[PDB]
Design a protein around this ligand. Sequence first.
Ligand SMILES: CCCC[C@@H](CC)COS(=O)(=O)O
Ligand SMILES: CCCC[C@@H](CC)COS(=O)(=O)O
Ligand SMILES: CCCC[C@@H](CC)COS(=O)(=O)O
Ligand SMILES: CCCC[C@@H](CC)COS(=O)(=O)O
Ligand SMILES: O=C(O)CCC(=O)C(=O)O
Ligand SMILES: O=C(O)CCC(=O)C(=O)O
Ligand SMILES: O=C(O)CCC(=O)C(=O)O
Ligand SMILES: O=C(O)CCC(=O)C(=O)O
Ligand SMILES: [Fe+2]
Ligand SMILES: [Fe+2]
Ligand SMILES: [Fe+2]
Ligand SMILES: [Fe+2]
Lengths: 254, 254, 240, 240
Amino acid sequence: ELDVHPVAGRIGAEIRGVKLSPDLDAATVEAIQAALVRHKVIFFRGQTHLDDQSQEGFAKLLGEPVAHPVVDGTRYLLQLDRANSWHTDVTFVEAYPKASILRSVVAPASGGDTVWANTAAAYQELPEPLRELADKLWAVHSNRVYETEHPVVRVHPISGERALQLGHFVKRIKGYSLADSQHLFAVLQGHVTRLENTVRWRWEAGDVAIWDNRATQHYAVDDYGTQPRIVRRVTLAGEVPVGVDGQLSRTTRK
Amino acid sequence: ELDVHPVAGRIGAEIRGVKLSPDLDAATVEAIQAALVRHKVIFFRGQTHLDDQSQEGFAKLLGEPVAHPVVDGTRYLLQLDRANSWHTDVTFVEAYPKASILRSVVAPASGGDTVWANTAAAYQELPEPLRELADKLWAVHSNRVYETEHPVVRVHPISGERALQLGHFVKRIKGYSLADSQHLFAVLQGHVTRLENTVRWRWEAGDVAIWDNRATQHYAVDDYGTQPRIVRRVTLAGEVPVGVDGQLSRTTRK
Amino acid sequence: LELDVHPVAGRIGAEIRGVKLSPDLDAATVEAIQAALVRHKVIFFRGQTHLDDQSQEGFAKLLGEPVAHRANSWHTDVTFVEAYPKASILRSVVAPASGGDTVWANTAAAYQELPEPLRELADKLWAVHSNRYETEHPVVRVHPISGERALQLGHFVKRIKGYSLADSQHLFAVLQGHVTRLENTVRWRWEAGDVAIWDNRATQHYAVDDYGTQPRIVRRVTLAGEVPVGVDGQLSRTTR
Amino acid sequence: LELDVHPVAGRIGAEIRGVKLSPDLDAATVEAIQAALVRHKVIFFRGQTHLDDQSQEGFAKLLGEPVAHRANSWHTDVTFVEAYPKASILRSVVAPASGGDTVWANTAAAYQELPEPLRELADKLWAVHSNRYETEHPVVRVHPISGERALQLGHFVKRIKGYSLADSQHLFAVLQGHVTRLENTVRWRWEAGDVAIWDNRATQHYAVDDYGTQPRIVRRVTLAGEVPVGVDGQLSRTTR
Ligand SMILES: CCCC[C@@H](CC)COS(=O)(=O)O
Ligand SMILES: CCCC[C@@H](CC)COS(=O)(=O)O
Ligand SMILES: CCCC[C@@H](CC)COS(=O)(=O)O
Ligand SMILES: CCCC[C@@H](CC)COS(=O)(=O)O
Ligand SMILES: O=C(O)CCC(=O)C(=O)O
Ligand SMILES: O=C(O)CCC(=O)C(=O)O
Ligand SMILES: O=C(O)CCC(=O)C(=O)O
Ligand SMILES: O=C(O)CCC(=O)C(=O)O
Ligand SMILES: [Fe+2]
Ligand SMILES: [Fe+2]
Ligand SMILES: [Fe+2]
Ligand SMILES: [Fe+2]
């Protein structure tokens, strides 16, 4: 039983009384993994003891770190020093990351928030006929150099929850003209970013966020001007998405 | 066997060698009714003998004329002397007209066309998952004083063909926010008005058009300035629309 | 005075500390509050648990003239009338344990960030606002104190005057999408005793409805405002 | 000359009778054709069954300099290059019995009908056209003969320069929706031997793909055009 404090009504929770480290016991790790599946994004404040090697070793307890170049003295640590567009991380590849662990090193005095959206709540709130349509759709994601076909709805490998898989890397919905694709995307993506499905975090140096990349999107707010902002992320390797009918994503260009 | 000449690839046919009148035989009438179901809109040129009473008596052979005020010396004849918005006639009511018979009395030397769209071809061309969604949708039509709920897809009482029922009188798709309704309408209505599904007619005095209002929309082009344009229409009473599941439209405000 | 002012987001919103609101604040404090408000668009005071209905109304009276009349849709208060409120003062009486946030958007920053050709078009537009009263307001208002131009849009807008429905919808979507762009907003998570005051001339706001059946009770005093002036000096007008 | 000219739709398109096209037309006829073209945007000659490949090319040569390089999408020909064609001459060799029409839109009428604030914004926009060559063209072109302003948009447009993707899409949808509004268009049903010539500086067109496997064969000569000039006198420029 962790000290868990929900931040918004439908997503997000701060976990208190825990100091992250490469030496956490299996029970704390398990309770972290469960809070993560349930809340989609979790927050840990005052992790000021943490450093590059230590963040990477903590990460190792949650899954297998994977390269996205990297921070020096590390194998896996990525620095961001602006991602102000809604997106799920790396969906242009087949088995994109399952989770990301992000630590604030330098935090602007004003601005520099991050927002997450719960794509499983977004799916559940759709009227039934629209869920049934979403269940059937496939989208081409691209970093334009990769192009991957993913189902629009993914069945979460642990919870079994269905979640929308959309975001900035989507180039089009397969089977549809450009105009129709744009309208279908706008409806479904509009439900992901509806404010009720989101939580916004104001960072302080030493804050750590971990989110389930299988069931969120996120957005870094670029309102901080020339104030320094440095964050460091470890990303954890994920599985091939499974659609509602059991079909699997497939990379189609490389 | 009428002399039938298709005008566009997917809708519209001119019928030659026939002089419309209140005295046409059951066979000619039947062959006209069939060309109408098949082609959605049919055209008869050189009907210069026709007049108000005679148009009304011809109409009587095709169904039951119904008031939409009316042209004098007639019970049913409506004059239009500008409908430049895509629409199916009177869908704000439950049992809107099944067909309309329109005669050109004064025809601009340039401009003043009418265009029809085949809403059955529009339905058939949708990808299957989108047809399945359309099969489930209901829309509120309104003359804002009536409000009627119609299924978005109507099963044609004679052909059994499914056709989209949308157009200018739709206020919203029931069950959806305003934003989502607007996107869903734009996709489905965009397929109705796609040029391939339409036929445009340039009028000459004495031209007569008859169209199946259960499976078209139409639009009067307002490009003729102050050139006189007078047309006279008789409209024929229609049935209550049946949806794919057998549900019936219902007026909900009066 | 120099107030203890702590900006919340980069382009809007500031918490003011070391002030206990009351009907007895001095002219200097009230002036410094009015200035922070103009500057930051929405300002927050925490720990105002001594405050009550009568006391909120008396404090409000120092900032302007109070005026009689789940909001999860972006809006500027009462823009369906001619001289809609200049400001609102909102106190949290009961705050849900999770959810129940309010977001504000800075419509002056939204205007300034438009490319120049787009700002010029905005400066010419008028919109019809309605509570279906119907009032015509300029899409761009010149703020009577700062002279800052701000977009006047939101949920009460029925159409942009002089355009087809389709064009109106596209034009509204561009300008309103700038207002609600995350960069121009601030989200506040309420605690009982928090008070927010915002400049209704240069914001919109949205009450997030993510708290289910948790109790939530807030009390608002609204302050009377002026008739909007457009960039060319024309005035808003009620038409129905 | 005074040609026998019969307008097809109210705002674009005219059939010219009593003329048999050929490489031997006199300067007066050619001038009167050039004038009808400028005025009506697209002109039609029926019954040109004597014409053949060599004869079409020779006739074309009287109207400008010929230039080497199912189109059911609205477009202006080759706008992905700097000096795209000023005109095209198109002959129907085989015409399907039903379907196979072509539609043209008058982009000068589309510009003129915009409300004034919208025309002013259009006069400032630039767009990137691409055949994915990438060329920057002004959204509004000043026609080198008539001085008429016309919208330069259509299927080759990738984005409006200086705007986000979402804004670009809204702005393109408003301006392009005016181009394709039915009132600004004319649809021609072809017969073998019909010839259409259009002013590619002030139109778009669309070939309707409703004829299935019916044979359809058309032959086009295209005439070289100038670099577009915007309202401020800037020039289009290829950038990739
Ligand atoms: C602007 C959107 C890009 C977001 C980036 C941050 C550099 C996230 O990259 S990702 O790991 O490939 O998803
Ligand atoms: C502008 C759209 C209205 C179209 C009208 C013509 C007056 C058709 O009226 S209808 O018979 O109620 O459908
Ligand atoms: C749904 C948004 C409407 C907001 C209402 C609350 C019912 C209050 O705002 S106001 O009428 O502009 O003062
Ligand atoms: C789909 C529209 C493209 C039109 C092509 C035909 C493949 C011709 O137009 S052009 O390249 O601008 O000359
Ligand atoms: O900068 C942030 O807050 C998040 C950036 C981002 O998208 C990521 O690291 O996945
Ligand atoms: O004026 C026309 O061509 C048709 C007008 C119309 O919509 C109708 O009569 O149903
Ligand atoms: O309940 C809120 O948070 C704001 C509601 C609202 O729109 C108002 O009080 O003006
Ligand atoms: O085939 C047509 O009708 C026109 C095709 C086309 O776009 C062209 O020739 O420029
Ligand atoms: Fe990311
Ligand atoms: Fe009609
Ligand atoms: Fe409000
Ligand atoms: Fe072309």
